[PDB]
Every structure is written in structure tokens, then in C-alpha cells.
Amino acid sequence: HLVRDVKKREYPKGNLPPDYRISLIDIGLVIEYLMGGAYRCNYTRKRFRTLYHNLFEINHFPFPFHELMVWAVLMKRQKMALFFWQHGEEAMAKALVACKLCKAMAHEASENDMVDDISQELNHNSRDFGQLAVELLDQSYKQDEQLAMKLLTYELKNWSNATCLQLAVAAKHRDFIAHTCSQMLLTDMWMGRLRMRKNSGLKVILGILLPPSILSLEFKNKDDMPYMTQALIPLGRKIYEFYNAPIVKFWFYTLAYIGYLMLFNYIVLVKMERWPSTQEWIVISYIFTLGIEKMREILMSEPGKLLQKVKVWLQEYWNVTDLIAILLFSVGMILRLQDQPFRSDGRVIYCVNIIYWYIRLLDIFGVNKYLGPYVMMIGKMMIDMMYFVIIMLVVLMSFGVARQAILFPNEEPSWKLAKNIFYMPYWMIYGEVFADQIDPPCGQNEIQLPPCKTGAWIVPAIMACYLLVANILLVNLLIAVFNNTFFEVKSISNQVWKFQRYQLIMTFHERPVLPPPLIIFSHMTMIFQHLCCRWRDYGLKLFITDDELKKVHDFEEQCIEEYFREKDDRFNSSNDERIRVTSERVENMSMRLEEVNEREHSMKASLQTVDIRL
Amino acid sequence: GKLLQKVKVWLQEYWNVTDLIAILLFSVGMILRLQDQPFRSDGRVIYCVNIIYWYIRLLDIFGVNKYLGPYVMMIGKMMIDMMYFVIIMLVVLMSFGVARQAILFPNEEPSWKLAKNIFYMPYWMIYGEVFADQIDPPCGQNEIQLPPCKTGAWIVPAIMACYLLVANILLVNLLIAVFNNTFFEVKSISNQVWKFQRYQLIMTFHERPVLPPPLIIFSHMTMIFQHLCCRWRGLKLFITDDELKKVHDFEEQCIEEYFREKDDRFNSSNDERIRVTSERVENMSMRLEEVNEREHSMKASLQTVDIRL
Ligand SMILES: CC(C)CCC[C@@H](C)[C@H]1CC[C@H]2[C@@H]3CC=C4C[C@@H](OC(=O)CCC(=O)O)CC[C@]4(C)[C@H]3CC[C@]12C
Ligand SMILES: CC(C)CCC[C@@H](C)[C@H]1CC[C@H]2[C@@H]3CC=C4C[C@@H](OC(=O)CCC(=O)O)CC[C@]4(C)[C@H]3CC[C@]12C
Ligand SMILES: CC(C)CCC[C@@H](C)[C@H]1CC[C@H]2[C@@H]3CC=C4C[C@@H](OC(=O)CCC(=O)O)CC[C@]4(C)[C@H]3CC[C@]12C
Ligand SMILES: CC(C)CCC[C@@H](C)[C@H]1CC[C@H]2[C@@H]3CC=C4C[C@@H](OC(=O)CCC(=O)O)CC[C@]4(C)[C@H]3CC[C@]12C
Ligand SMILES: CC(C)CCC[C@@H](C)[C@H]1CC[C@H]2[C@@H]3CC=C4C[C@@H](OC(=O)CCC(=O)O)CC[C@]4(C)[C@H]3CC[C@]12C
Ligand SMILES: CC(C)CCC[C@@H](C)[C@H]1CC[C@H]2[C@@H]3CC=C4C[C@@H](OC(=O)CCC(=O)O)CC[C@]4(C)[C@H]3CC[C@]12C
Ligand SMILES: CC(C)CCC[C@@H](C)[C@H]1CC[C@H]2[C@@H]3CC=C4C[C@@H](OC(=O)CCC(=O)O)CC[C@]4(C)[C@H]3CC[C@]12C
Ligand SMILES: CC(C)CCC[C@@H](C)[C@H]1CC[C@H]2[C@@H]3CC=C4C[C@@H](OC(=O)CCC(=O)O)CC[C@]4(C)[C@H]3CC[C@]12C
Ligand SMILES: CC(C)CCC[C@@H](C)[C@H]1CC[C@H]2[C@@H]3CC=C4C[C@@H](OC(=O)CCC(=O)O)CC[C@]4(C)[C@H]3CC[C@]12C
Ligand SMILES: CC(C)CCC[C@@H](C)[C@H]1CC[C@H]2[C@@H]3CC=C4C[C@@H](OC(=O)CCC(=O)O)CC[C@]4(C)[C@H]3CC[C@]12C
Ligand SMILES: CCC1(c2ccccc2)C(=O)NCNC1=O
């Protein structure tokens, strides 16, 4: 099923004839499609294409097990694949790749409507291989924490030059990106080349606001852990390593967002004249220079097809709601630069972006380890709040239509009838019963009150039923929902926060130095450098040597051997297996001891016969 | 011994710190009140600020009772969850307030009352006052000619609706859930911490003077006079050496019985019983195989010797 899809999508054939002898080149194209992204497998590298063309001790694969694992995972031979995982090397890479392969064959088989037993069992094998990765990583963390880092970040040349961090995030395997080893390593990329492991927020902000405070900060050495993408003199390196550190580039974009948001408030509370004010020109700068940055994230993303780059970008929901608000603020500008009333309406459009850009402070707030899980808590409870909104919408419009029609009989077609359905009953949920208009005094002589509309006594009574259902039934049931969905959403949103930290370090490592209002200088540097170097890759890898590659390898088979050894020891000392082994040995006692008694019967009988003959 | 270390140990107790702060502000209020106007009203204002603190302290006063004290520590532990709610609600409140003030009043001038109108109306909106006359005021019509509707003023009831839904229904109920799931943990910790702070309670009131604060100046002058005249001219039991011998022997009895009862629980837990039985049964299998081989040889030798006889 896979080989038909990768050949039909390459050169549109259709159903390939079943006699097709699927080449290792063709297997390589299956591997790239299931992996996704920029993974370009060693089969379809241009050297092995030459080798297959020139052949159909340079025939044996240097590390055969790696190719066997991929062979057994693609053909669903699970017990064979788990034996291949133990016997070998780069096992951390092998388990995380097999976790992504098993998940990728899972949704492909469900898409092709292959039988459900295929899709369930491939998702079971994905959880098995992913669980072996956590239990190997934990065992590496117990022995030597520093060598576990090198295992997590070294450049996996046999797996399209990725690292074990990138492979797990691509596999969305949340527990691997939430273990203590990965989080304290992601902290090390966050602080960058700074060793300021204390009161981190205050010292970095004082470095930004007062640039002389950078010189009093403790910086790590040049060989502690060089996480990098592609491979007076103190004081210049001190400023450069500070103003490239990802935690520095965060708070320097954050004090420019808080500086933007403080400025835009001033232009809309205070009047706007015909031409833009000095404050408003800094605002207009911030939106468009951000729009160039949001454009940059699309073009310099992972895929190659422009539409596939766009599809990667639409996945992040905070990124797409940036560009909608940027285009909305542009529309608000062009109207604002015209004569009123066009200006008045572009004033209004400006104030509606305020509804968005304070809510984007929620995402900036997500960096903190306490407010961050609180924010993802809010998003999950709103799905429960939508069901509250639908049930409330029936009860609100049932009171609203009944009140507007009984109290106001002889009305005419107007859209204000629709407003009066939703106006008064909606504010009754929030503490205002509109007490003067509950039961207005009618049909009496105060002056002379107007005559009572027929059936107006029903309006207090259906008010009573509506306020009981709204405020003591459905709001109270929403409280009961929110408690009993709070625990599991808490446990999920901590681990999802710890998993989306990886996105947060890696994007800010790729964002420019200067803030959004000054990003036009760095953006001109990138455009000029790309054009001039033409005339004349992602992630932070450790890029290790060869003799350290051997050593990091030897650390890892000892972790495979010790993991499997403690698994055999825990099984052979668990109470379940001790009762089993005791019971089976006692069963083999009973045939034995009964045989001893029958033979001692013949021995005592032969002793009696010899006693007769002696 | 050092004065700064004395100050730091004293500054560990937070109530003590806020006491010294409140006494300094009451001193400042006294000085401004014993001057003349326009300073006497300011000293009165400082006095009325200080009564808020001297009323809250009642919670520390109430912290001796077995039921109220842990409740006060519970309130203190849920303040942090409220602080997170405060930040989130502040973001939503400022969004509605800025949108309201900028849309409804479009020709204002630089003034600090803009910041008041940002925060005033949305904040009282959370506590059951929707300010019904100013939700959608009638405009753009004659009934007297009402002033023309500001452009986009229809948005204000809609962002009102969304703000009140995300204020009174979402965040408050989420804080109910947050307080409600963490109540058990905070309860257990607050009872244990209250039982711990009772030591500081007894200790401090053992060392405090007898006369009340309004008459502690007599005990304080007695203390300074006693310190001078005697310079010139915890609660322990101080047991005898015999009783030291008895409490010592009591303590080896408890240490022995502790280790012995631990070894009994280890050698009567189901885990060790199953382990020990399994090891014995393994040795039994080797030995019964040996007895089988030997007695088979013995039966064969008995048959051969019976052939001999
Ligand atoms: C780093 C983060 C935490 C804060 C960065 C933002 C502030 C430094 C900015 C944002 C809003 C700015 C204010 C916006 C508007 C004005 C009015 C402006 O006055 C006028 O335009 C008319 C009178 C005159 O010309 O002085 C004087 C500067 C001031 C106070 C600005 C001072 C600088 C402020 C506080
Ligand atoms: C780049 C932003 C996002 C963050 C950094 C904030 C500051 C660099 C900005 C924010 C507010 C700005 C101020 C806003 C308004 C004014 C008034 C302006 O006054 C005049 O031009 C007076 C004469 C005239 O009216 O033409 C002088 C610049 C100044 C102080 C600006 C200086 C630069 C400030 C402090
Ligand atoms: C003044 C009035 C108009 C109030 C404004 C109401 C809305 C415009 C805001 C208020 C709260 C916001 C929500 C707060 C929390 C979240 C979770 C967050 O989403 C995520 O983190 C993605 C994962 C997830 O949804 O759990 C950002 C979107 C969302 C739904 C926000 C969407 C926009 C909302 C509904
Ligand atoms: C069940 C709950 C969760 C949602 C249902 C409530 C909303 C859909 C309602 C309640 C208040 C309504 C608003 C109340 C008042 C107005 C003003 C109205 O504008 C005018 O009447 C023009 C100005 C004027 O004539 O005074 C336009 C509709 C609107 C925004 C209404 C739109 C629909 C709203 C937001
Ligand atoms: C399942 C639930 C969501 C149903 C809710 C339906 C009502 C909210 C809708 C459906 C039909 C609507 C009516 C359809 C037609 C008209 C005529 C319309 O008249 C005009 O616009 C004036 C015509 C002119 O003079 O040009 C005013 C709104 C009104 C009463 C509408 C008011 C709102 C109504 C009752
Ligand atoms: C289904 C849930 C999740 C969302 C709620 C959707 C509806 C209940 C809202 C969305 C759009 C609203 C409408 C948007 C605009 C108007 C025009 C508005 O017209 C006026 O106020 C005319 C001016 C006047 O004379 O007063 C009357 C309310 C109405 C129909 C609103 C009624 C309530 C609607 C249908
Ligand atoms: C009239 C207006 C100004 C309202 C006043 C509100 C606050 C001044 C009060 C109300 C409840 C008080 C809280 C109630 C409970 C506690 C626990 C208590 O803390 C402890 O006992 C732990 C600290 C220690 O004793 O070492 C005293 C602080 C605190 C947070 C209090 C701090 C002051 C608060 C917030
Ligand atoms: C849960 C969190 C988000 C609450 C945060 C709300 C506060 C930051 C706001 C809400 C109401 C505000 C107050 C509303 C009114 C006033 C009166 C104002 O006094 C004057 O303007 C003096 C002259 C006059 O009274 O007209 C000074 C600011 C103050 C205390 C405001 C200070 C800031 C407050 C306390
Ligand atoms: C980004 C979030 C977290 C905080 C947003 C804070 C705003 C509510 C503050 C910060 C900048 C403030 C402005 C900074 C400068 C001024 C000028 C100031 O003008 C004067 O003081 C002139 C003399 C006078 O009229 O008193 C009036 C307040 C105002 C508009 C401030 C109003 C309130 C603002 C917008
Ligand atoms: C964790 C939470 C509780 C922190 C909340 C901090 C801010 C939201 C508060 C604290 C101090 C407040 C300020 C204290 C005093 C004033 C002066 C006040 O000025 C006036 O009212 C001037 C007189 C007039 O009304 O014209 C306007 C609100 C403002 C800026 C307040 C706005 C809201 C502030 C910044
Ligand atoms: C506009 C907000 C922001 C930002 C700032 C801090 C954290 C996350 C995002 C920015 O200032 N420029 C780059 N991207 C962005 O959207």
C-alpha cells in the first residue's frame, strides 16, 4: 500500500503491477514519506543510487541492524524488530524512528481503509517502541547525566543528520520531552552560553535595560556544550553571546511587545488628528516589520513546496492569528489616512486589534512554568463552555421571544425585535434583573398608567423559571464540569507545556537579535547577505568527533544491557513469577516423591525377600 | 550575636515586620495630625489606612484556635492561585476597558482620567453591576435631541458580552476549580504547619512580659533597671543524673523494640515469605533429584545382591 502511494505521487502508473520488485531506492522513498519533513534517507542519497545502478567489501552495510529494524517495522514484524533493537548500536535513534514509523503507517492505513486491526496494532507498536526510548533515556540519566546529553544531541548521520530530540518532537512523544534529562538540557539551550542558573529573569532584564550589566554576568566556556546549527576581545564576545542567547532574545522581544502595547493604548485613548502622530508612526513600524518576520517564518520553514510551507505555518494557531490581525491593522491604517468618516471607522478597526493583542500576552505569559499550564487550562475548559453556551442559548431565546411578544404585541418588522430577544435576558445571568421592568405597575391611576397587555402576568413567572435554570442550574453545572475535568487537564497541560518548550527555544534561536521595531536592520542584513554570497539545516546539534562518537556509542550498549538485565531481574523477583515458579516446582515434586515411595515399596519388599533368603 | 543576624531572624516572621511598618506609619500619622491643616486631615487618613492592618492582624490573633488558624493558613496558600487569576483577569479587563474608552469617547485629550476610565467600569462589572443605563445608551434619535452615535458604538455591547462571559463564567469558575482541587493538599499542609508554629506560639508568650502592651512600659523599665543593677551588683526540665539514667534506659528499650519490630515486619511480610519459600523449594528440587538417582541405584544394587543370595 505504501509503495503504490510513493510511486503514484512521484511520477503520475497508478496501480503498479504486482510483479514490481520494490528496490531499496523505492523503500527509501517510503521512509522519507513516513518520516516527513527534511528527512532524506541514506537509500536515496546520491551515493547509494550510484551503487544500485552499478550493481543491478563495499556491499555490506556498515551497521546492518539499522536497515533490519526499518525492514521489520515496515512489515509489521514486531517481535523480530524488538530483537533487532537490542542487538546493535544507535538504539535511541532506532526506537524514536520506529515510534514515528509505526505512527505514520497507522494514519496511512486508516486513510486507505485497511482493516482496523492494522491501525490499532501499529499504534500499539508505536507506544511500545516509544516506551523503550523513555526507559533507555532514564537508565542513561542514572549512570552519567553528562553523557546522556551527548546521546540526546549528537548528529545522527545514519538518520538524515537529525538528533534524538528532533526525532522525538517529530514523533510527538510527550513523555520523552518531559523527562528530567531533556528538560534540563532544553534549559541549557534557553540560557545559551550564559551560566546564570539563578534568578534568571531579573538579571537578564537588567542586562537589556542597562547594557553595562552584561559584563558582570557569568558566561560558560567555549567547550562546555556547543549546541549549534552548522559548522577587548573578551568584551566583544560577552556582548555577542549575551545578545544571541534565546532567553535574552525572548525578554528583548517581550519588552518590545510591552513597549508596543503601551504605545498603541496612547494613540487610541488620546485623539488622532489628520496625519499620524510620532507615537503612531512607531506603532505602524511594529506591525509591518512583524509582518515581514511572520512572512520569513513561512519561507524559511522545513518543507520545500510553498503550499507545504504554508500548511506547516497554519498549524500554529497563535502564528496565523498574528497575520490576520496584521492585515486587519493595515486595512485600519488605509481608512485612517483618508478623510472622515473613513478615519472614524479605521479608528474602530484599531480598537478591535486591542481585543487581540492583549490576548496575545497569554502566549508570552506561557513561558513561566505556573501561568503557562494555567493558559492551556483555559483553552480546554472553553470546549466545555461551548456546550454551556448552546444550552444557554435555547433558554435565553425562549424567555426572550416570549417576553418581547407578550409585552410588546403590535410591533412591525424591524431588526430591533431581534436585539430585544438577546438584550435584556443576557444581562440577567450577570446580576441585573432589570428590577423596574419586571412587573411594571399598569392599569391603575397614579396620572394614568397605560393599560396592561394581555397575559403580562406570565412575564414575571417565566422570568422566575429562566433565572433558576440560568444561575443555579446551568452555571452551577458548569462549575461541576470544571472541577471533574480539572485533574486530567492539569496533568495533560503540564506535560504539553513541557513538550512545547522545544518549540519555544528553537524559534527564538532562529529569530533575529534586534526587536520587532528594529528588525528591519537585521532583515536587510539577511536579504543583502543571501544575494551577495550568491554572487560571490535546522536544530541545535552537538556535532561530535569520531573518538567521542565511539565513546558515546559504548555508553549506550551498557545502558541497553543494564535495562534488559533489570527487566529480567524485576520479572524473576516479582511476586507473580515467584508464586508461579514455586507452584510448578511443587507439581514436579508430587510425581517425584510418589515415585520415591513406590520404589521404596519395592526396596522394602526386596529387603524382606533377602531376609527370607538369609 | 551580631545585630544584623538578629534583625534577619526577626524579619523571618512576616507579621513582626508588618507590625514595625504599621507602627512607623502611625508615628508619621501622629506627627502630621499634631501639625495644623492642611496636614491634620492627612494624618487622619493615615490613621484610617492603619486600621485596615490592625483589623486584619486579628487573623494572627485568631490563629490559636484549632479550627480557625489552619483556615487562615489555607487562605494564605490560596492567595497565589488568586494572584494568577488576578494577572489573567487584568489582561481581559484592560482589553475591554481600553476598547470601551477608545470607542465611546473618541476626542479626548492627554489626561490621567483615561486610565481611571480604563479600570473603573469593567472592574465593578465582575461583582454583579453591569451598569445597565450605560450598556447601550439610546443615541442618534430625538425623544430633546440625543447626541449622535459615535462610530462603532454597537461593538461595545458585544465586547461587553464576551468580557462578561470570560469574566463571570470562565475565570471565576476556573478559580473555584483551582481552589477546590488543591484544597486537600493545602488542608493537610496547613494543619501540620499550624501544629509546627504552635512551638513559636508558646515560646514567644513565655518570654513576653506580664503586663499588657498599654502597661508594658512598667515591665520594660523593670527590665532595664534589673539589667543595670544586676550588671553592676526554651523550657527545659533539668532532670537529675538518676532520672537521666532512667530516661536513657527507656530510650535503649525503645530503640531495641523499634529495630526488632522492623525485623519482624520484614520477616513476616508476604514478599519475604514467598522469596524464602521459593529458595527452599529450589533446594528441595535439587535434593529430591539426588535422592531419586541414589535410591534408584540402591534398588538396582539390592536386586543384584538378591541375585547373589
Ligand atoms: C520597556 C517597557 C517595559 C516600557 C517601554 C515603553 C515606554 C518607555 C513608553 C511607552 C509609552 C510611552 C509614552 C507614550 C506617550 C507619551 C506622551 C508624550 O507627550 C506628547 O506626545 C505630547 C507632549 C510632548 O510633546 O512632550 C511624551 C512621552 C510619553 C509620556 C511616552 C513616554 C515613554 C513611554 C512610557
Ligand atoms: C520602539 C518601541 C516599541 C519601544 C521603545 C520605546 C521608546 C524608544 C519610545 C516610546 C515612546 C517614545 C516617545 C513618544 C513621543 C515623543 C514626543 C516627541 O516630541 C516631539 O517630537 C515634539 C515636537 C513635535 O511635536 O513635533 C519626541 C520623541 C518622544 C519623546 C518619543 C521618544 C521615543 C519613545 C520614548
Ligand atoms: C473584551 C471582550 C471582547 C473579551 C475577549 C474574549 C476573547 C476575544 C478572548 C478572551 C479569552 C481568550 C482565550 C484564552 C485562552 C485560549 C487558549 C489558547 O490556546 C492555546 O493555547 C492552544 C491550545 C488549547 O486551546 O488548549 C489561546 C486561545 C484561547 C482559546 C483564547 C481565545 C480568545 C479569547 C476567547
Ligand atoms: C447565550 C449567550 C452566551 C450569547 C447570546 C448573547 C449575544 C448573542 C447578544 C447579547 C447582547 C447582544 C448585543 C446587544 C446590543 C447590540 C447593539 C445593536 O446596535 C444597535 O441597536 C444600534 C445602536 C442603537 O440603535 O442604539 C446591535 C446588536 C448588539 C451588538 C447585540 C448583538 C448580540 C448580543 C451580543
Ligand atoms: C433556531 C433559532 C436560532 C431561530 C431564531 C430565528 C429568529 C432569531 C429569526 C428568524 C426569522 C427572523 C425574522 C425574519 C424577517 C424579519 C423582517 C425584517 O424586516 C426588515 O428588515 C424590514 C423590511 C424593509 O422595510 O425593508 C426584520 C427582522 C425580521 C423580523 C427577522 C427577525 C429575526 C427572526 C425572527
Ligand atoms: C451559536 C453561538 C455559539 C453564538 C451566538 C450566535 C448568535 C446568537 C448571534 C451572532 C450574530 C448575532 C446577530 C448580529 C446582528 C444583529 C443585528 C441587530 O440589529 C439591530 O440591533 C438593529 C438596530 C436597532 O434598531 O436596534 C439585532 C441582533 C442581531 C440579529 C444579532 C442576534 C444574535 C446573533 C444571531
Ligand atoms: C479593606 C481592604 C483593603 C481589604 C484588605 C485585604 C487584605 C489586606 C487582607 C485580606 C485577607 C488577608 C490574608 C489572609 C490570610 C493570610 C495568611 C497569613 O499568613 C501566614 O500566616 C503565613 C505567614 C507567617 O505567619 O509566617 C497572613 C497573610 C495572609 C495572606 C493575609 C494577607 C492580607 C490579606 C490579603
Ligand atoms: C483583579 C485585578 C485585575 C484587580 C485590579 C484592579 C485595580 C488595578 C483598579 C480597579 C479599580 C481602580 C481604582 C478606581 C478609582 C480610583 C480613584 C482615583 O482617584 C482619583 O481619580 C482622585 C479624584 C477622584 O476621585 O475623582 C485613583 C485611582 C483609583 C484608586 C483606582 C486605582 C486602581 C484600581 C484599584
Ligand atoms: C502593557 C501593559 C502590561 C501595561 C499598560 C499600561 C498602560 C495602562 C499605561 C502605560 C503607559 C501609560 C501612559 C503613559 C503616558 C501618559 C501621558 C500622561 O500625561 C500627563 O501626565 C500630562 C499631564 C497631565 O495631564 O496630568 C497621561 C497618562 C498617559 C497617557 C499614560 C496612560 C496609561 C498608560 C497607557
Ligand atoms: C498583581 C496585581 C495586583 C498588580 C496590579 C498593579 C497595577 C494594575 C496597578 C497598581 C498601581 C495602579 C495605579 C495607581 C494610581 C493611578 C493613578 C490614577 O490617576 C488618577 O486617577 C488621576 C486623577 C483623575 O482621575 O483624573 C490612575 C490609575 C493609576 C495609574 C493606577 C493604575 C493601575 C495600577 C498601575
Ligand atoms: C508580536 C509578538 C512576537 C512575540 C514576542 C515574544 C514571544 C512570542 C512572540 C514578537 O514580538 N515578534 C516575533 N513574534 C511574535 O509574534
In angstroms, what is the span from residue A268 Cα to ligand 1's centroid?
Answer: 14
DSSP alpha helix (H) spans, A500-574: 501-510, 519-535, 547-572
Grid coordinates representing A442? Answer: 399598569
Ranges of H-type helices in A154-199: 164-170, 180-191
Q: CB of B44 within 8 A of CB of B58?
A: no
What length does chain B have?
Answer: 309
Mutation target to probe the A interface, by most A beta carbons within 10 A, among B155, B170, B182, B294 is B170
A113: helix, strand or coil: coil
Residue A417: all three cell numbers together: 425585535
Cβ-contact B282, A582 below 8 angstroms: no
The count of residues in chain A is 614
Q: How would you class B232 by CB atoms within 10 Å of its CB: exposed for 0-12, middle for 13-18, buried for 19 or more?
A: exposed
Q: How far apart are CA A445 and CA A574, in angstroms?
A: 91
Distance CA A111, CA A335 (A): 48
Phi, psi of A162 (to 5 degrees): -85, -175
The residue with cell 532524506 is A40
What is the rounded distance in angstroms from the CA atom of residue A247 to the CA atom of residue A201?
A: 9
Contacts of A479 in chain B (CB under 8 A): 173, 176-177
- Please list, in sequence order, all residues whose beta carbon lies within 8 angstroms of the beta carbon of residue B2, skipping any fewer than 6 positions away: none
The percent helix, strand, coil of chain A (3-state, each to 5) is: 70, 0, 30
Interface contact A374, partner B, CB < 8 A: yes
CB A459 within 8 A of CB A440: no
Q: Count Cβ atoms below 10 Å from residue B130 Cβ, excluding itself.
A: 21
Grid-cell match 487562605, residue found? B75
What is the spatial distance between Cα A459 and Cα A471, in angstroms, rounded to a whole number? 18
As given in the structure block, the three cell numbers for residue A47 are 551515493
Instruction: Identify the H or E element spanning A235.
Output: helix A233-242
The distance of B264 to chain A (nearest Cα, Å) reads: 20
Partners of B95 on chain A (C-beta within 8 Å) are: 354-355, 358-359
Closest CA to A541 of A149, A183, A302, A229: A229
**What single DSSP character describes residue A156?**
B
Q: Which residues of B touch A476 (CB under 8 A)?
A: none
Q: Is the dihedral of CA A373, A374, A377, A382 positive or negative?
A: negative
A417 vs A410: CA distance, rounded Å: 12
Residue pair A158/A42 in contact (Cβ under 8 Å)? The answer is yes
Look at B151 and A345 and tell me if their CB atoms are within 8 Å: yes
List the residue whose alpha carbon is closest to atom 16 of ligand 5. Answer: A413
Cβ pair A305, A340 in contact under 8 A: no
CB contact under 8 A, A607 and B302: yes
Q: How far is CA A521 from the centre of its chain?
A: 32
To which residue does cell 516506551 refer? A131
* DSSP classification of residue B171: I
Distance CA A262, CA B86 (A): 19
Q: How far is B193 from chain A (nearest CA, A)?
A: 24
Way the structure was solved: cryo-EM
Distance from C-alpha of A173 to C-alpha of A283, rounded to nearest angstrom: 41
**Count of alpha carbons within 13 Å of A464, Cβ hemisphere only?**
6
- In terms of phi and psi (left: phi > 0; alpha: psi -120 to 50; beta: otherwise), the region of A99 is alpha
Angle at A58 between CA A52 and CA A59, to 5 degrees: 55
Cβ atoms within 10 Å of B1's Cβ, excluding its own: 4
User: Residue A559 phi/psi, 5° resolution?
Assistant: -75, -30
- Contact of A606 with chain B, judged by CB distance below 8 Å, is answered with yes
> In A, residues 471-510, which contact B (CB 8 Å cutoff)?
475, 478-479, 482-483, 486-487, 490
For chains A and B, count residue pairs whose Cβ atoms are closer than 8 Å.
Answer: 177
Count other C-beta atoms under 10 Å from residue A130's C-beta: 24
Who among A268, A431, A593 is closest to B130 (CB)? A431
Q: Whose CA is nearest to atom 6 of ligand 2?
A: A259
Closest by CA to B305, choosing from B294, B292, B297, is B297
Give A585 to chain B, closest Cα distance, Å. Answer: 7
Crossing angle (nearest 10°) for helices A371-407 and A475-483: 160
CB of A262 shorter than 6 A to ligand 1: yes
Contact (CB, 8 A) for A133 and A171: no
For chain B, positions 155-174, list CB contacts with chain A under 8 A. Answer: 155, 157, 159, 161, 164-165, 168-171, 173-174
- Is the separation of the CB atoms in A190 and A505 below 8 Å? yes
CA distances from A110 to A8, A122, A362, A382, B201 (A): 19, 11, 36, 30, 68
Task: Fill in the amino acid letter for A125.
Answer: N
- Report chain breaks in chain B, C–N > 2.5 Å, as residues after which they occur: 143, 233
A431–B151 C-beta distance less than 8 A = no
Q: Which amino acid is at A23?
A: S
CA distances, A76 to each of A1, A102, B309 (Å): 13, 9, 72
Q: Which residues of B touch A613 (CB under 8 A)?
A: 306, 309
Query: Which H, E and C letters describe A17-71, residue by residue?
Result: CCCCCCCHHHHHHHHHHHHCCCCCCCCCCHHHHHHHHCCCCCCCCCCHHHHHHHH
Put simply, the answer to whether B91 touches A351 (Cβ < 8 Å) is: no
Q: In 3-state terms, what secondary structure has residue A228?
A: strand
Q: CA dist B215 to A469, B122, B209, Å?
A: 60, 50, 10
* Residues lining ligand 5, Cβ inside 6 A: A 413-415, 417-418
What are the grid coordinates assigned to A369, written together?
512554568
Residue of A nearest to B279 (CA): A582
Residue pair B86/A365 in contact (Cβ under 8 Å)? The answer is no
Residue A274: CA count within 13 A, CB half-sphere? 1
The upper half-sphere exposure of residue B90, i.e. CA atoms within 13 Å in the direction of its Cβ, equals: 8
Residue identified by cell 531506492 is A25
CB neighbours (10 Å) of residue A343?
17
Using a 10 angstrom Cβ sphere, with 0-12 exposed, 13-18 middle and 19 or more buried, the burial of residue B294 is exposed
Nearest to B213 by CA among B54, B74, B102: B54
Which atom in ligand 1 lies closest to the alpha carbon of residue A278?
21
Distance, in Å, from the CA atom of A487 to the CA atom of A497, rounded to the nearest integer, reads: 15
Side-chain-side CA neighbours of A180 within 13 Å: the count stands at 8
Contact in structure between A588 and B284 (CB atoms under 8 Å): no
Q: How far apart are alpha carbons A59 and A357 in whole angstroms?
A: 60
Cell of A612: 527370607
Backbone angles phi, psi at A541, to 5 degrees: -105, 160
User: What are the Cα distances from residue A610, in Å, to A233, A515, B307?
Assistant: 108, 110, 9
Neighbouring C-beta atoms of residue A46, cutoff 10 Å: 7
Residues contacting A78, CB < 8 A, separation 6+: A72, A121, A125, A128
Distance separating alpha carbons of residues A557 and A173, to the nearest angstrom: 23
Q: Specify the amino acid at residue A50.
A: T
Q: How far are the Cα atoms of A341, A453, A576, A581, B285 from residue B281, in angstroms, in the given order?
A: 97, 95, 16, 9, 6
Label residue A420 left, alpha or beta by phi (over 0 means left) and psi (-120 to 50 means alpha): alpha
Q: How far apart are CA A101 and CA A95, in angstroms?
A: 10
User: Residue B87 to residues A320, A328, A358: CA-CA distances in angstroms?
Assistant: 25, 27, 12
Name the DSSP letter for residue B142.
Answer: B
d(CA A608, CA B306): 10
For residue A420, CA distances in Å to A401, A414, A468 come to 8, 11, 21
Which cell is A72 given?
Answer: 521489520
Q: Distance (Å, rounded) from C-alpha A94 to C-alpha A73?
A: 11
Closest-CA residue of B relative to A384 is B170
Angle between helices A306-315 and A278-299 (to 10 degrees): 120
B129 and A CB contact within 8 Å:
yes
> From the CB of B86, is ligand 10 less than 6 Å away?
yes
Q: Which atom of ligand 2 is nearest to the CA of A260?
A: 3
Give the separation between CA A549 and CA A544, rounded to whole angstroms: 6
Contact, A333 vs A280, CB < 8 A?
no
Q: Is A442 in the pocket of ligand 9 (CB under 6 A)?
A: no
Resolution in A: 3.2
Burial class of residue A230, CB neighbours in 10 A (0-12, 13-18, 19+): exposed
Distance CA A390, CA A387 (A): 5
Q: Does B296 touch chain A (CB under 8 A)?
A: yes
Residue A325's alpha-carbon distances to A329, A355, A359, A515, B52, in angstroms, are 6, 10, 12, 19, 46
- Rounded Cα distance between B298 and B291, Å, is 10
Cross-chain residue pair A575–B270, CB shorter than 8 Å: yes
Pick the atom of ligand 7 nearest to B73's CA: 17
Residues paired with A156 in a beta bridge: A162
**A257: part of which helix (H) or strand (E)?**
helix A246-269
Partner A, chain B 242-271, Cβ-Cβ below 8 Å = 270-271
Pocket test for ligand 7, best of B59, B71, B81 (most atoms within 8 A of CB): B59
